[PDB]
């Protein structure tokens, strides 16, 4: 059956001799060449860069907490930047930051010297982490630390940055204490007056250009991730492929997930309108999320394959009709390909002179076996 079209016709008829006529053997079908995915532009970008580019970071005890959402978080720039020294992530893979997203993101910024960077970590205690900024053990997020000795240190000594060293109890995770009150380390009440038993809990760091490793200032930023039952408004960038037209492809225009060939269309949509439907409630045209154009979606070409042959007694030659298929896309093609309304004929030679119909093809065209 698979040897040649006449043998397929013989198998379909289950007869070794087939009479003159046109017989439908199989069904032509165009499989999708590729898959195209286009999601809208990343118009809203989460301003993590301006947090990283801030001239003066927040104090370690008074760490700035910002909730960011309704945007797109791009972590590719963070990976590309080589300034970061410690990029330890707890509870989440740094690679999957773009792939997976949360409902809300919280970011904290502070400046600390080199040797105290390691103290700011979940499940770790330190002289500064207990009384300035604490992270819970089960917390999921990333810690970003980079050297900023040139910016945050000078020859005279940069005392602008301040840290807390004394408190009655350690600060709770994600809780900031900004109290500047005098600490009552001794039994004698301070009453707001510095004394032998009273030392000011807040201190200003001393920075020099030649501090060395472990003592130079470091700008450390910690970001938080958590999930809520509310709909998520912030997520990472989505993959967008180049647009292809006049080719049978698989399109996913934000959930169409359909198969068809995309062509330019003259139909005009309302500004809020994206989809398009015909009478039968089938997708007909979809607007490209990137640009502003209407791409009519007619689906892949398909039809029945009909073998046009005379009687096997008369001769052994066939012509193939691919019904309702423009055979710019497809006996093998390239042999006397002639196009008509019902399809195009492979293996038949068109003649301008007209005779009476012998094998009805369709739309007035008839095949015949003639010299």
């Amino acid at each position, epitope marked *: 059956c698979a040897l040649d079209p006449l043998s397929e016709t013989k198998c379909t008829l289950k007869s070794f001799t087939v009479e003159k006529g046109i017989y439908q053997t199989s069904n032509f079908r165009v499989q999708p060449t590729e898959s195209i995915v286009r999601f809208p532009n990343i118009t809203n970008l989460c301003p993590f860069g301006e947090v990283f580019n801030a001239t003066r970071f927040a104090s370690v005890y008074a760490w700035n907490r910002k909730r960011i959402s309704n945007c797109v978080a791009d972590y590719s720039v963070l990976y590309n930047s080589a300034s970061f020294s410690t*990029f*330890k992530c707890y509870g989440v893979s740094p*690679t*999957k930051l773009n792939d997976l997203c949360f409902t809300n993101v919280y970011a904290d910024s502070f400046v600390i010297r080199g040797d105290e960077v*390691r103290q700011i970590a979940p*499940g770790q205690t330190g002289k500064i982490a207990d009384y300035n900024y604490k992270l819970p053990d089960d917390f999921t997020g990333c810690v970003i630390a980079w050297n900023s000795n040139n910016l945050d240190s000078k020859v005279g000594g940069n005392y602008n940055y301040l840290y807390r060293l004394f408190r009655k109890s350690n600060l709770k995770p994600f809780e900031r204490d900004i109290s500047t009150e005098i600490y009552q380390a001794g039994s004698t009440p301070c009453n707001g007056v510095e004394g032998f038993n009273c030392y000011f809990p807040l201190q200003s760091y001393g920075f020099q250009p030649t501090n060395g490793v472990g003592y130079q200032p470091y700008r450390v930023v910690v970001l938080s991730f958590e999930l809520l039952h509310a709909p998520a408004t912030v997520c990472g960038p989505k993959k967008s492929t180049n647009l292809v037209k006049n080719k049978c492809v698989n399109f996913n225009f934000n959930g169409l997930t359909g198969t068809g060939v995309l062509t330019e269309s003259n139909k005009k949509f309302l500004p809020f309108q994206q989809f398009g439907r015909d009478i039968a409630d089938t997708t007909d045209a979809v607007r490209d999320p990137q640009t502003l154009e209407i791409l009519d979606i007619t689906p892949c070409s398909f039809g029945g394959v009909s073998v046009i042959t005379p009687g096997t007694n008369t001769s052994n030659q066939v012509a193939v009709l691919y019904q309702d298929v423009n055979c710019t896309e497809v006996y093998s093609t390239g042999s006397n390909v002639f196009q008509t309304r019902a399809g195009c004929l492979i293996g038949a030679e068109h003649v301008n002179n007209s005779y009476e119909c012998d094998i009805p093809i369709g739309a007035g065209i008839c095949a015949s076996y003639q010299t």
Partner: antibody
Amino acid sequence: EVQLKQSVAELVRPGASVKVSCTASGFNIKNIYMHWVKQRPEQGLDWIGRIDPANGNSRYAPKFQDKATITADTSSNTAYLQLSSLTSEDTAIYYCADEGWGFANWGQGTLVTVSA
Amino acid sequence: DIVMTQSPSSLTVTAGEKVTMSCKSSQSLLNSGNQKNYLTWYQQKVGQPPKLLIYWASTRDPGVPDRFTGSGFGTDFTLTISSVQAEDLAVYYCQNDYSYPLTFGAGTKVEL
């Protein structure tokens, strides 16, 4: 903190299949594409392969290709490692990973041994 | 596939004395953008799985962080320790990460 509690070691027979499950606490597998690693005793440690929760498309080391197949469960906070054609060399300790810059969190250590 | 060898893989020191070990890495592990090498050190005792001693070839992991700083452009790496203690009596593994097929090193035994 974060810990990886993989399944306790169990006896296996040659020519059979063994599934090893690694559990995690403090997070979910959905953002973690955990690696799998085996430590051959009295020999340099070697890497088995990598998997992903969604679209796993697992890639293994060339020595373990078509031999160690590992699947990732979307839910239940677990991932399953499957082995076949276990021999005497296959008797080694296995660990989990957190695919950080290095393998951040390793399993407690399962000692798979095949014998009669 | 990168062949990773650690030297000398066995060496003895007195307590609180510097150690000189290095594992040579081929393929010149380097990444665009970030100049930090994608080779991570490890510290493995007898009984529990290895833990990150150094990642990015220069980053002190929290916990017993007595130096471990490594200087290397990719062709060579160093994990000298100034003073060795009970927690330092272990085997150190250096592993490549830039190449997707990664192979761990043989390891080096150090004892007080």
